[PDB]
Design a protein around this ligand. Structure first.
Ligand SMILES: Nc1ncnc2c1ncn2[C@@H]1O[C@H](COP(=O)(O)OC(O)C2=CCCN([C@@H]3O[C@H](COP(=O)(O)OP(=O)(O)OC[C@H]4O[C@@H](n5cnc6c(N)ncnc65)[C@H](O)[C@@H]4O)[C@@H](O)[C@H]3O)C2)[C@@H](O)[C@H]1O
Ligand SMILES: Nc1ncnc2c1ncn2[C@@H]1O[C@H](COP(=O)(O)O[C@@H](O)C2=CCCN([C@@H]3O[C@H](COP(=O)(O)OP(=O)(O)OC[C@H]4O[C@@H](n5cnc6c(N)ncnc65)[C@H](O)[C@@H]4O)[C@@H](O)[C@H]3O)C2)[C@@H](O)[C@H]1O
Ligand SMILES: [Mg+2]
Ligand SMILES: [Mg+2]
Ligand SMILES: [Mg+2]
Ligand SMILES: [Mg+2]
Ligand SMILES: [Mg+2]
Lengths: 271, 271
């Protein structure tokens, strides 16, 4: 079925061993640093589940490298746009991750400069939606600037429950160097956080991209019209209602471009 | 040999028919955009060879779509950082391209806001090299904002002679939706642009990324330490010095991450 195909392509298991998943994903981070001579990692810590998980895995990886006599560091970075309404949760995430370094970059003045220039040049105010994608891409710029200045790789938090819907900004939070969470469903990420001892508030809250000025903290499920339990059931190979398979297979097909390098005439996937 | 592998991976031909390259690449643009249902294309026009070529191909594609009774448009956009020293060549490129629409977005206030915030937040001056990548990524943001507002796809200008060296900013000018120039060597692209009727001032224009404040208009060759005709010889399967081949093969491996989606543990290309 298409469901089986999507599961295979997104690397999803129906059942996991959380300890082994953690080992595999920390080992990946370590191996990628060994092979490339990298100095460590940078990651935006939002106060949401995914960045909490990826941040703790990163911290464990750099600690393990150092325990082996090597050199590595992790910079966690707060990236509010002005006042972030769930700053408290982001601080709690930092308290749990216990990163080597905890930095901050408020993206609002950059986003405002851009938005104001856009109207000055075109006569048009950006739509809230398009401004939201400017925010996500500005966060990419901020992380790549810290990584470039400090000699580090940019982690991304994409996982299977965002990949299937294409629920990320292309060259925004989609723009990263390496991905410790690939293949995990949303529920599976919660299981890994539990194994790691995370505070439950960080995985009980609603997932949100929090990109819109007019609809702040909008839940992903509100935007998508599909819940993470539906997504996860699909991705874990459960026998789900036909409405879920219809919705997800359409979104997956429509967003393939986000999961491929830019298309050329030599590629066949898009035809 | 590794040369054969790279030539194949980058879709390079040893010999081309310039007129049919033009036909094929225009047709790619037509076929792709129609598949997506997008209204057309946006592209940053720097004055340089690659964007002049890709821009003219785009304009031909949209004109062909309209000739067959469809709807399509091309927005060419100037993206200076303040005063661009070779603005005159960019204006000449626009004159040659004859784009449907001609827009401008000056990135300087955005880049200055970012840079000033970086120093405020970190206590660290953003360095010229890292600021240059901020400029390239701000250009990406600008093109995606126009594209999102106007319903267009973002063209990229990557070609084999930049691809092999990774001579583009990751998620800057590398960030695009589709690539009409894939597989062309530098001199092959020049042949297309000449066949399209461009003046020598455009098709023999010295390549530059022009990203640095301390070294404006630096030529690519100054930065790379190798010239485009050596790169082109390698890519086209000619004999080159051990000097050239060792250097290009090492750089190709070191920059594979720029030619792949973000790495996960399920990928092996980095090993
Ligand atoms: N004024 C304009 N007006 C309108 N439009 C335009 C203008 N200017 C440009 N345009 C448009 O843009 C295109 C492109 O123009 P073009 O061809 O002239 O530009 C160019 O030539 C051009 C464009 C931009 C840049 N360049 C060069 O690239 C290098 C960047 O590498 P780099 O400086 O080192 O920076 P990077 O961020 O790309 O890569 C390093 C980062 O990568 C990650 N990393 C590293 N190793 C690694 C790994 N092993 N695994 C995983 N990740 C890893 C880390 O995060 C790390 O920090 C450095 O050498 C630069 O000088 C070139 C044109 O065709 C136009 O369309
Ligand atoms: N406050 C913070 N502090 C610190 N760190 C962070 C913060 N916030 C986030 N972070 C960090 O970021 C990550 C991610 O966080 P996360 O998981 O909560 O965010 C999120 O959930 C999140 C983040 C960003 C976005 N979302 C959603 O994606 C959609 C994007 O619109 P979209 O319309 O899908 O926009 P797009 O540009 O991504 O895609 C459209 C463009 O694609 C092109 N195109 C289209 N068709 C097509 C084709 N067939 N072929 C080729 N190209 C094609 C065209 O150019 C077209 O314009 C839209 O629905 C958005 O709401 C979600 C976190 O984990 C953190 O690491
Ligand atoms: Mg997320
Ligand atoms: Mg979130
Ligand atoms: Mg170029
Ligand atoms: Mg300092
Ligand atoms: Mg140039």
């Amino acid at each position: 079925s298409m469901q089986e195909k999507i599961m295979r392509e997104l690397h999803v298991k129906p059942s996991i061993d959380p300890k082994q998943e953690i080992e595999d994903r920390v080992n990946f981070l370590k191996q990628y640093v060994k092979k490339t001579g990298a100095k460590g990692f940078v990651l935006g810590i939002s106060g949401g589940q995914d960045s909490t998980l990826a941040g703790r895995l990163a911290q464990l990886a750099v600690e393990s490298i150092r325990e082996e006599g090597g050199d590595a560091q992790f910079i966690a970075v707060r990236l509010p746009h002005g006042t972030q309404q769930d700053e408290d949760d982001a601080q709690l995430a930092l308290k749990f991750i216990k990163p080597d370094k905890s930095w901050k970059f408020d993206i609002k003045s950059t986003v405002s400069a851009f938005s104001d220039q856009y109207q000055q040049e075109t006569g048009d105010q950006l739509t809230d939606f398009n401004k939201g994608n400017v925010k996500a891409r500005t966060r990419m710029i901020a992380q790549y600037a810290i990584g470039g200045q400090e000699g580090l790789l940019v982690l991304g938090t994409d996982h299977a429950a965002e990949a299937v819907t294409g629920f990320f900004t292309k060259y925004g939070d989609g723009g990263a160097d390496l991905l410790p969470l690939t293949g995990l469903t949303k529920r599976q990420g919660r299981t890994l956080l539990k194994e790691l001892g995370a505070p439950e508030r960080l995985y009980l809250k609603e997932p949100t991209a929090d990109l819109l000025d007019e609809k702040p903290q909008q839940s992903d499920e509100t935007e998508l019209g599909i819940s993470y339990d539906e997504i996860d059931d699909y991705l874990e190979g459960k026998e789900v209602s036909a409405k879920v398979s219809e919705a997800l297979e359409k979104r997956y097909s429509m967003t393939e471009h986000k999961r491929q390098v830019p298309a050329s005439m030599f590629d066949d996937w898009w035809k």
